[PDB]
Write a protein that binds this ligand. Structure first.
Ligand SMILES: *[C@@H]1O[C@H](CO)[C@@H](O[C@@H]2O[C@H](CO)[C@@H](O)[C@H](O)[C@H]2NC(C)=O)[C@H](O)[C@H]1NC(C)=O
Ligand SMILES: *[C@@H]1O[C@H](CO)[C@@H](O[C@@H]2O[C@H](CO)[C@@H](O)[C@H](O)[C@H]2NC(C)=O)[C@H](O)[C@H]1NC(C)=O
Ligand SMILES: COc1ccc2cc([C@H](C)C(=O)O)ccc2c1
Ligand SMILES: *[C@@H]1O[C@H](CO)[C@@H](O)[C@H](O)[C@H]1NC(C)=O
Ligand SMILES: [Fe+3]
Ligand SMILES: [Zn+2]
Ligand SMILES: [Zn+2]
Lengths: 6, 335
């Protein structure tokens, strides 16, 4: 529930 | 003005995109990748501008900064004088579908059965049923709940890919694109129609559009609605006419996303393209129909009447809704 997954 | 670069997921989508590009005089051109996540990355790099996404993918894209632009709007259930482009979207019903002949099977006896999902990370095929199952079982081991599944995008050696079939040649088993026979809404419903799985996680429209002659596709053309039942969360089974009272969730409609800096241009180009190629568009059916692909839901769902403007210039969280975003976040804690 926070950062871009790439 | 600039051209808009669409991202096509897999080669069938690429073919349709190329026809669109030709017809639009290269106002739209095409990039292609093998999965939706890789398309999301092309957009983040600036090597494509936009694509239309299921809500679970909108969550991945939105976490990475991409924004919703226009949403699919299908035929309204109620009377509206509003033009399609201005009508608020209604969401679609995620459902669990089984064969009427598989008589003992309910929501509460799904453990160790065979399942068919649209793909990992999509709303009705995955985030809603697996989020519910994690919660009800109190366990993150959702990869050990069903005995075998087809869940495109999972590890091809794992139980979650055991039922997937790949392409004509049996290549690309379990890839999350239309090359996989059991991909997407229609692939997952085909997985149940052929009794490869005991249950399919799709949406209500899928069942109607692929039964009772609504599809002439070989695998669908003989299916009868009355041979299916929906699984309700209270443990009952209903006829597929009762989806309004026997669904898992109401999902936010698929929608186009783009970088924030190209959203207004993408919006303008799409409104004009759908005027040419949309339902009743100036050049559909004569030359090209943007929202047809012989039931295979390529680029857009076949049941899309138009892409509609969004109210409230919503962020991705606003567009998905807080409850759904929260549900996705909870499920992703498991992996
Ligand atoms: C389940 O989905 C089907 C298919 O979209 C819906 O039935 C269609 O509804 C529209 C709007 O009423 C009709 O004009 C179409 O003719 C129907 N299509 C078919 C193939 O029958 C149905 O309304 C949906 N059920 C619920 C509860 O939303
Ligand atoms: C699975 O359970 C979690 C935990 O109960 C649910 O998360 C809650 O959702 C409600 C309703 O939106 C919120 O008010 C709570 O803040 C959420 N709790 C937590 C700890 O995040 C989640 O909605 C459930 N998943 C599904 C698919 O129903
Ligand atoms: C209370 O939270 C919401 C917010 C936005 C929503 C939008 C939609 C439609 C289907 C959409 O986003 O396309 C449905 C439900 C929603 C619930
Ligand atoms: C191509 O885009 C330009 C600029 O909006 C416009 O003049 C033309 O009508 C467009 N044509 C098609 C066929 O999409
Ligand atoms: Fe979806
Ligand atoms: Zn409901
Ligand atoms: Zn807002």
């Amino acid at each position: 529930l926070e950062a871009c997954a790439f | 003005y600039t051209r808009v670069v669409w991202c096509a997921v897999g080669p069938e989508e690429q073919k349709k995109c190329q026809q669109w590009s030709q017809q639009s005089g290269q106002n739209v051109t095409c990039a292609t990748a093998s999965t939706t996540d890789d398309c999301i990355v092309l957009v983040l790099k600036g090597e494509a501008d936009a694509l239309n996404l299921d809500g679970g993918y909108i969550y991945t894209a939105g976490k990475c900064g991409l924004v919703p632009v226009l949403a699919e709007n299908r035929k309204s259930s109620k009377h509206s004088s509003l033009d399609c482009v201005l009508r608020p979207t209604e969401g679609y019903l995620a459902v669990a579908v089984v064969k009427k002949a598989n008589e003992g099977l309910t929501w509460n006896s799904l453990k160790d059965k065979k399942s068919c999902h649209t793909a990992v990370d999509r709303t009705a095929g995955w985030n809603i049923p697996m989020g519910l199952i994690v919660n009800q079982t109190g366990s993150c081991a959702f990869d050990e709940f069903f005995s075998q599944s087809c869940a495109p995008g999972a590890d091809p050696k794992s139980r979650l890919c055991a039922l997937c079939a790949g392409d004509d040649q049996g290549l690309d088993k379990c890839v999350p694109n239309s090359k996989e026979k059991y991909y997407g809404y229609t692939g997952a419903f085909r997985c149940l129609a052929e009794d490869v799985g005991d249950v399919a996680f799709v949406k209500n429209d899928t069942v109607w559009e692929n039964t009772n002659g609504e599809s002439t596709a070989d695998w669908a053309k003989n299916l009868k609605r009355e041979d299916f039942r929906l699984l309700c969360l209270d443990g009952t089974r209903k006829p597929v006419t009762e989806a309004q009272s026997c669904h898992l969730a109401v999902a936010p409609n698929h929608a186009v996303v783009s970088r924030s800096d190209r959203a207004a241009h993408v919006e303008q180009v799409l409104l004009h393209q759908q005027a040419l190629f949309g339902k009743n568009g100036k050049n559909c059916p004569d030359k090209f129909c943007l929202f047809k692909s012989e039931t295979k839901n390529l680029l857009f769902n076949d049941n899309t009447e138009c892409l509609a403007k969004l109210g409230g210039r919503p962020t991705y969280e606003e567009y998905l809704g807080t409850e759904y975003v929260t549900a996705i976040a909870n499920l992703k804690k498991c992996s």
